[PDB]
Structure formats: C-alpha cells, structure tokens
Design a protein around this ligand. Structure first.
Ligand SMILES: OC[C@H]1O[C@H](O)[C@H](O)[C@@H](O)[C@H]1O
Ligand SMILES: *[C@@H]1O[C@H](CO)[C@H](O)[C@H](O)[C@H]1O
Ligand SMILES: *[C@H]1O[C@H](CO)[C@H](O)[C@H](O)[C@H]1O
Ligand SMILES: *[C@H]1O[C@H](CO)[C@H](O)[C@H](O)[C@H]1O
Ligand SMILES: *[C@H]1O[C@H](CO)[C@H](O)[C@H](O)[C@H]1O
Ligand SMILES: *[C@H]1O[C@H](CO)[C@H](O)[C@H](O)[C@H]1O
Ligand SMILES: *[C@H]1O[C@H](CO)[C@H](O)[C@H](O)[C@H]1O
Ligand SMILES: *[C@H]1O[C@H](CO)[C@H](O)[C@H](O)[C@H]1O
Ligand SMILES: OC[C@@H]1O[C@@H](O)[C@H](O)[C@H]1O
Lengths: 49, 48
C-alpha cells in the first residue's frame, strides 16, 4: 500500500466516555387509611314517673 | 543458460539477464520484485 503505517498523520480518537448510572428503586407509598371512628355511647332509656 | 532465480529476460537473443526492477507505487516507497521460477521472462512483486 502506498502510504505505509508510518505515514498515518491523524491523531487517535479518545476512549469511550463512561456508562450512565442505573435508575432508582421504586419509591415507597403513602400510608394507608386508619380504620373508622368508634360510634359514641347511646342515650339511657326513659326514667320513671 | 536459464536466467537466475531473481533475474529475467524477454528478448530471445540476449547476452545477459536483467535484474527485476522495484515496483513504484508512490513517493519514496519501492516494492522489491522477485521471480517465481528459475527461467522466467516477467517479474512480480516479491511480497505476494
Ligand atoms: O379507628 C381508629 C381511629 O378512628 C378515629 C378516631 O378519632 C381515632 O381516635 C381512632 O379511634
Ligand atoms: C397502606 O396503603 C397502601 C396504599 O395502597 C397499600 O395499599 C398498603 O397495602 C396499605 O397497607
Ligand atoms: C490511534 O488512531 C490513529 C488514527 O487516526 C492512528 O491509527 C494511531 O496510530 C492510533 O494509535
Ligand atoms: C467522555 O469521556 C471520553 C474519554 O474518557 C471523551 O473524552 C469524551 O469527550 C467525553 O464526553
Ligand atoms: C455504557 O456507556 C459507555 C459508552 O457511553 C460504554 O459503551 C460502556 O461499555 C457502556 O456500559
Ligand atoms: C422514591 O424513589 C424516587 C427516586 O427518584 C424518589 O426520588 C424518592 O427517592 C422516593 O419518592
Ligand atoms: C345508641 O348509641 C350509638 C349512637 O349514639 C349507636 O347508634 C347505638 O347503636 C345506639 O344504641
Ligand atoms: C332516669 O334514667 C336516666 C338515665 O339517663 C337518668 O339517670 C335519670 O336521672 C333517671 O331518673
Ligand atoms: O476499554 C477501552 C475501550 O472501551 C471498552 C472498549 O471495548 C474499548 O475499545
């Protein structure tokens, strides 16, 4: 070949830039709903006459 | 006599064989040329 390996005048290219990071884990979750309220007491029956 | 191993001749009546010339591809590079057989009338690049 006409221009041998000593005549190659182009500087070499850089190495590959590093690979990106992975994604994050799945986020947690919003705390579920506390169970419903306890119904109040009940009116004691009619007093006597 | 047969031409020597790296010499060649093409004309019939010759008083001496001629050495194979180098092959010119460009500036300042020459590929030397050899011969395949003993008595031959043409030279090829000696690398291949
Ligand atoms: O059900 C649990 C939760 O419900 C409501 C009440 O206000 C809380 O005091 C608790 O009792
Ligand atoms: C608390 O609430 C979240 C909301 O989706 C989830 O269901 C959990 O299972 C529960 O305990
Ligand atoms: C890096 O690449 C260049 C090509 O421009 C050249 O071949 C160098 O010899 C090599 O090290
Ligand atoms: C990433 O890195 C390579 C070499 O490590 C190169 O310089 C790139 O320019 C860069 O983006
Ligand atoms: C991730 O990226 C770089 C190039 O950006 C390289 O190819 C690594 O091999 C890959 O893991
Ligand atoms: C769950 O993970 C994601 C990561 O991107 C978020 O930012 C928080 O770390 C959390 O909500
Ligand atoms: C009275 O008390 C509560 C309400 O005040 C509930 O409904 C009971 O069933 C009733 O007896
Ligand atoms: C009759 O019963 C009621 C209960 O609510 C109350 O104690 C009265 O004082 C009683 O007379
Ligand atoms: O390690 C250097 C370069 O990046 C990696 C590739 O295989 C290599 O060409």
């Amino acid at each position: 070949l006409s221009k041998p390996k000593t005549a190659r005048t182009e500087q070499s290219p850089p190495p590959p830039s590093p690979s990106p990071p992975p994604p994050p884990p799945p986020s947690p979750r919003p705390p579920s709903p506390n169970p419903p309220s306890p119904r109040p007491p009940s009116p004691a029956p009619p007093s006597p006459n | 006599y047969k031409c020597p191993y790296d010499f060649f001749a093409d004309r019939p009546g010759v008083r001496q064989c001629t050495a194979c010339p180098p092959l010119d591809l460009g500036g300042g590079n020459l590929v030397e040329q050899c011969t395949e057989d003993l008595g031959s009338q043409r030279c090829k690049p000696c690398s291949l």
